[PDB]
Design brief:
The structure is cut from a larger assembly and holds chains A, B, C, D and E. By secondary structure, chain A is mostly beta strands. Helices cover 14% and strands 36% of the residues of chain A. Chain C binds four RNA strands through β1, β2, β3, α1 and β5. Chain E: Pfam families: Ribosomal_L17 (PF01196). Chain E: GO terms for molecular function: rRNA binding; structural constituent of ribosome.
Chain lengths: 114, 120, 219, 42, 116
RNA sequence: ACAACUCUCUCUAAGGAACUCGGCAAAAUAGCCCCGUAACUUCGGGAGAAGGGGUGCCCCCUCACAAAGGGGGUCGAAGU
RNA sequence: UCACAUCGACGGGAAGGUUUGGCACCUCGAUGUCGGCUCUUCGCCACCUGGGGCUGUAGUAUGUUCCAAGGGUUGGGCUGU
RNA sequence: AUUGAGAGGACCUUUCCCUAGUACGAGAGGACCGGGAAGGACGCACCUCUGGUGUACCAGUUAUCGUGCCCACGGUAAACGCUGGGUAGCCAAGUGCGGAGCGGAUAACUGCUGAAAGCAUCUAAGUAGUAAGCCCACCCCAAGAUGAGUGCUCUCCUAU
RNA sequence: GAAGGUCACGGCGAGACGAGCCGUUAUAGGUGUCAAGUGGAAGUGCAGUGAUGUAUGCAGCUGAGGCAUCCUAACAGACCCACAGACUUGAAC
C-alpha cells in the first residue's frame, strides 16, 4: 500500500462500510428530503426532519447536506452528516428544478419558498 | 454571537416586541453570547397595554442565533433570526407560551422553556 | 529531557473525520510509517555520561548517504536511513541495537501521546501576526495602521530593552503538542489515528512518545 | 534620519570590500560556465 | 505566504499575463522556435502543451476552444491537420527549453522554447 | 521574486457606531413612468418632501399615446 | 463594663519625592507642553487572587492588621479633558 | 548524534455539583477540609467539520468592439464590467491541546524538646509543619559555555 | 583529487537575499486517470409564430490535490581541501 494513497483507501473503507449499514439515495441540490434519526437523549423517540437540500458539500466520510425549512414561523437550516450512524432513514420525497450548486440565495428570498 | 448593542427579537408573549442587548452574564470578559447564555437587555418596544413597559432593563436568555451552534453528532443549526426569551429571574419566562423552535441544549439549565415549546 | 517511554518516529498523512457507534464526530490525524523505527545505538552512565537510545527511520538507496553515516549505521547492522533521533530514558536495558520497535505492541490505545514536530513556516512576519499585537485606528486620520507604535520609554532607559517583541520569522520550529488521544490502531494498514491536530503539513517527521506527566518522571 | 559623523576611513574600506567580493563570486561562477561551454550539453 | 500556490505571474496583472501567454503561444506555434526569458518560457509549457493536447481531438467544439485562445485563425487550422500525424506517438511534453546567455541591457536571463 | 511594512484598490461569517473630539472615512440611495406628499408659510414655497408600486426578452389590439399604453407569454438569485 | 476589637482629641517624631510651592544650578546658535492610540517595563505604601494573627470571631459575611508584586485589575453614557 | 552552563515562554482564574443541608445555629440561614464540573481570559498548534477570502476555476448577465455574416467565442468597461458559486493555500467566528508535583528551601505564623533565669520561653544547640511568592520540574533555544563539552563513524593520495 | 564541503542543474508544505530541505535517471512540468469545484456545453434532433424549452449527457469546462508513466527539462560539468597532527610531563605493553 502506497503512503500517499492511504487517506484515499481509508475513506474507501469508511464510506463503503457505512453504506452497507443503509444504502443512501442520489440526493443533490433542490430536492425535498425527509430524514429521521435515532436521537441519543436516552430515548429512541425518532425525531423526523424535513425540507429542501440547498447544498451538498462532497467530502468523503463527512459528506454532508444542508437542509433548509421554514419551521413553525421561523426559517431554519440544519446540515446533516450524510453517513452518520445516528441517522436512520433518508427518503427523497420530491424534486424542485433548480439550477445552481448551492442555494444560499434562498435564505433571503421569501417564506413562501419552503 | 449576540453582543452589546445587538437588537434581538422576543420569542415569547411576555408583551415585549423587541430587545436590545447590553451585557453578557455568566463567564465574565465574554465577547458575545451564543445560544444558552443569559444576557441583559433594554426593551426597545412593546405592545401598548402589557405589564412590561418600554425602556426597562431586564434579563433575557438567547434561544435563536444566526451563528451555527454545533452538536457532537456533527449536525449544525443556523436560524434566520437572533432572538431571546425574557427570563423572569431563576426559572420560567414571564409568558406561559413560547414560539418558533428551540434546541435540546437549552433543556439542561432551562427545563421549563422546552416544556412550553411548539416544535423542539 | 528524560522521556516517559521510548518514542517512535512517524509521518503525518492529513486529517480524517472518524465516527463512533454513538455518532460522535471526531477530527483525527492519520499517521503513517516507513521502514523501521530500528534501534541504532545505546548510551550509558558507564561510557557516555547518560542513558539513551538512538532510533533511525525512513529507508534509502545507500548512495544518498555519506561514508561516516554509512559506517555508523553499518556498525549496527541496519538498513540505510535518515533521521537518527535519541530518547533519553532512566531505563537503559532491553534496547540492544538492530531491534525493531513495534508501535502496535508498545502503545496499546487510549494512551494520550505527546507528539513533537517542526511546524508550518510563515516567513518573516509582522508584530500583529507574530506576537498578537493590536493595530491602531483606520480612519480619524491615523497614519499609524499596522505597526509597533512606540518601542521603548525615554531618556531614562535610554535604549531598547532586550527581548523586546518585534517583527521576525514566525514558524518552522519544534513544538510538542502533548496529551493526545489514540483513537484507533489499524493492524491491517500500520496507521495510527490520533485525535486532533499535529504540527506541520502532510510529510513531516513526528516524534511519537507517551505522556510526560510529573507523576512519571523525576521529583 | 541623518548621520552624526562620518565613517571616514577603514570602515568604508571594510564595507566596500564585501561588495567587491560579490564581484568575486560572480567571477568564479562565470569561470565555471566556460568549461561547461566546452564539450557536450545535449 | 505563497504556500502551495502555483502560478507563473510574469511580473504582470491578469490583464496582461494572459495577453502575454496567448501571443507568445501563437508566435511559438507559427515559427516553431522563439527566443525569450526563462520565466516567460517556463510558464509557457502549460499552454502550448494544452493546445497540442486540444489538437488531438479535432472536433467542432475543440477547434472553437482553441480558436478563442490563439487570435489568428490560420495558425490553429495548421494544427488539427498537422498535429495527429507528427505527434500521434508522443504522449504529453511537446516542448523543449534550451537556455542561452543573458540579455545585454539588463542582465535578463534568457532561453529558447520550440516544439519537440 | 511574491517576506514584514506603506500606499492605490477588491471582498468579507455574527453584530451594526459598540469607533471617535465628531459617523471623519467608507457604505447605502440613484434613470425613467405611475400612485402618493405633512408641520409651517412672506401664499411664490416647503417638495424630488416623506412613502410606495412598475421596468429585461418575445407575441399581440389602433383610419395616429417616440419598443407606446394595454393584454398575454418566457428567462435569471437579480431587468435603470 | 474596658484608652490599646474598632476609632482616637490636645500635642510630639519620622520617612517618601507622585501634588501645590521656594531657589534660578544644566539647556534661549530650540530638548515640541495636555489628553487619546500603539507598545512597554518597573515600585509597593496590596483592589482581587495565595497563606496568616486579633476580633465587640456562633456559622455565613465582615472589620483590623502581618507575609506575599507570580498573575490579573471590564464594556459604555457625558466632558478636549 | 546529543550533554547542559546559561537564557527565555509558560505555572492565571470561575461558578456549579458531591461532601452536606452535614458541623454551627432557637430559627433565619449555612461552613472549614478534600474530590469531581462545565466556562472566562490567555498561550501553542491545525484545517476534518462550519465558514471568509480565493482577479485559477466554473456559471449567469449589461454595454459596445472584434472574430466576413447567423451560431459560437475573444477584448475592454483601472490593478475581476457587474453579480452568483468555489478546490488547494492562507485565515478565524471553526478544531484540537495546554496550566498538572505527597520535589526542595523559605516568608508571616503555629510548634516540639529546652536553658540562660531550679519556674517559664518556637532559640541561644537541634528539629517539624508551613504560601499563586523563590529554586528544580513543564515547553522552546543553547558549547562564540574562547570554560569553544561528550559520543558514534569516515578520511589522510600526490601534479593529483 | 581524501572524507567532505561549495557551486551549477529541477524544485519545495523552506524562503526578503543568504539559509534550510528534497531531487539530479518520479524532482518540477506535461500526459493518463481519479477525488473535488461548477452546474447541464457545443453540435444535432424534436416542440413552440417567437423569447425559449427539451433529449442525446451527474454532461462540458476546470482539476493549486492524490496516484500512475521518464514524453520534456535535471545535460554539461566546475571550485575548495589533506605534514597520520608543533611543545612538556607522568602512568602503560
Amino acid at each position: 500500500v502506497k503512503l500517499g494513497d492511504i487517506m484515499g483507501i481509508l475513506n474507501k473503507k469508511a464510506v463503503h462500510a457505512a453504506e452497507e449499514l443503509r444504502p443512501v439515495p442520489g440526493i443533490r441540490t433542490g430536492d425535498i428530503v425527509q430524514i429521521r434519526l435515532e436521537v441519543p437523549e436516552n430515548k429512541r423517540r425518532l425525531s423526523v426532519y424535513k425540507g429542501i437540500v440547498i447544498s451538498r458539500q462532497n467530502a468523503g466520510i463527512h459528506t454532508t447536506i444542508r437542509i433548509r425549512r421554514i419551521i413553525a414561523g421561523v426559517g431554519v437550516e440544519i446540515v446533516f452528516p450524510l453517513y452518520s450512524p445516528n441517522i436512520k432513514e433518508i427518503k427523497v420525497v420530491s424534486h424542485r428544478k433548480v439550477r445552481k450548486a448551492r442555494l444560499y440565495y434562498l435564505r433571503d428570498k421569501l417564506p413562501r419558498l419552503s | 454571537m449576540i453582543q452589546p448593542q445587538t437588537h434581538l427579537n422576543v420569542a415569547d408573549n411576555s408583551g415585549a416586541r423587541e430587545l436590545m442587548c447590553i451585557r453578557i452574564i455568566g463567564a465574565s470578559n465574554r465577547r458575545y453570547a451564543r445560544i444558552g447564555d443569559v444576557i441583559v437587555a433594554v426593551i426597545k418596544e412593546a405592545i401598548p397595554n402589557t405589564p412590561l413597559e418600554r425602556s426597562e432593563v431586564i434579563r433575557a436568555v438567547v434561544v435563536r442565533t444566526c451563528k451555527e451552534l454545533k452538536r457532537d453528532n456533527g449536525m449544525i443549526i443556523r436560524y434566520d433570526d437572533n432572538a431571546a426569551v425574557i427570563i423572569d429571574q431563576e426559572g420560567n419566562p414571564k409568558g406561559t407560551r413560547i414560539f418558533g423552535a428551540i434546541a435540546r441544549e437549552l433543556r439542561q439549565k432551562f427545563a421549563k422553556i422546552v416544556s412550553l415549546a411548539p416544535e423542539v | 529531557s528524560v522521556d516517559a517511554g521510548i518514542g517512535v518516529m512517524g509521518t503525518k498523512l492529513g486529517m480524517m473525520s472518524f465516527f463512533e457507534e454513538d455518532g460522535t464526530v471526531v477530527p483525527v490525524t492519520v499517521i503513517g510509517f516507513k521502514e523501521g523505527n530500528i534501534v541504532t545505538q545505546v548510551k550509558t552512565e558507564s561510557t557516555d555520561g547518560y542513558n539513551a537510545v538512538q532510533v533511525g527511520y525512513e529507508r534509502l538507496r545507500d548512495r544518498k548517504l555519506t561514508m561516516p553515516e554509512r559506517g555508523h549505521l553499518n556498525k549496527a547492522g541496519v538498513i540505510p536511513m535518515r533521521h537518527l533521533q535519541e530518547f533519553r530514558l532512566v531505563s537503559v536495558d532491553d534496547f540492544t541495537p538492530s531491534q525493531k520497535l513495534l508501535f502496535e505492541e508498545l502503545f496499546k490505545e487510549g494512551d494520550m501521546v505527546d507528539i513533537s514536530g517542526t511546524t508550518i513556516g510563515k516567513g518573516f512576519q509582522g508584530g500583529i501576526k507574530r506576537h498578537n499585537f493590536k493595530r491602531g485606528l483606520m480612519t480619524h486620520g491615523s497614519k499609524s495602521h499596522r505597526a509597533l507604535g512606540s518601542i521603548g520609554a525615554g531618556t531614562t532607559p535610554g535604549h531598547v530593552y532586550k527581548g523586546k517583541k518585534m517583527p521576525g520569522r514566525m514558524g518552522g520550529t519544534k513544538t510538542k503538542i502533548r496529551k493526545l488521544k489514540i483513537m484507533k490502531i489499524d493492524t491491517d494498514l500500520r496507521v495510527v489515528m490520533i485525535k486532533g491536530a499535529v504540527p506541520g503539513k502532510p510529510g513531516n517527521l513526528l516524534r511519537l512518545a507517551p505522556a510526560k506527566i510529573v507523576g512519571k518522571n523525576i521529583p | 534620519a541623518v548621520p552624526k559623523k562620518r565613517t571616514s576611513i577603514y570602515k568604508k574600506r571594510i564595507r566596500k570590500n564585501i561588495w567587491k567580493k560579490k564581484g568575486y563570486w560572480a567571477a568564479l561562477k562565470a569561470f565555471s560556465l566556460a568549461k561547461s561551454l566546452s564539450t557536450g550539453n545535449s | 505566504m505563497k504556500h502551495g500556490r502555483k502560478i507563473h505571474r510574469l511580473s504582470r496583472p491578469a490583464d496582461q499575463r494572459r495577453a502575454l501567454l496567448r501571443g507568445l503561444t501563437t508566435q511559438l506555434l507559427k515559427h516553431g522556435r522563439i527566443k525569450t526569458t526563462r520565466a516567460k518560457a517556463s510558464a509557457m509549457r502549460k499552454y502550448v502543451d494544452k493546445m497540442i493536447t486540444l489538437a488531438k481531438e479535432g472536433s467542432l467544439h475543440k477547434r472553437r476552444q482553441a480558436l478563442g485562445f490563439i487570435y489568428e485563425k490560420q495558425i490553429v487550422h495548421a494544427l488539427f491537420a498537422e498535429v495527429p500525424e507528427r505527434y500521434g506517438d508522443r504522449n504529453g511534453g511537446y516542448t523543449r527549453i534550451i537556455r542561452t546567455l543573458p540579455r545585454r541591457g539588463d542582465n535578463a536571463p534568457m532561453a529558447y522554447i520550440e516544439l519537440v
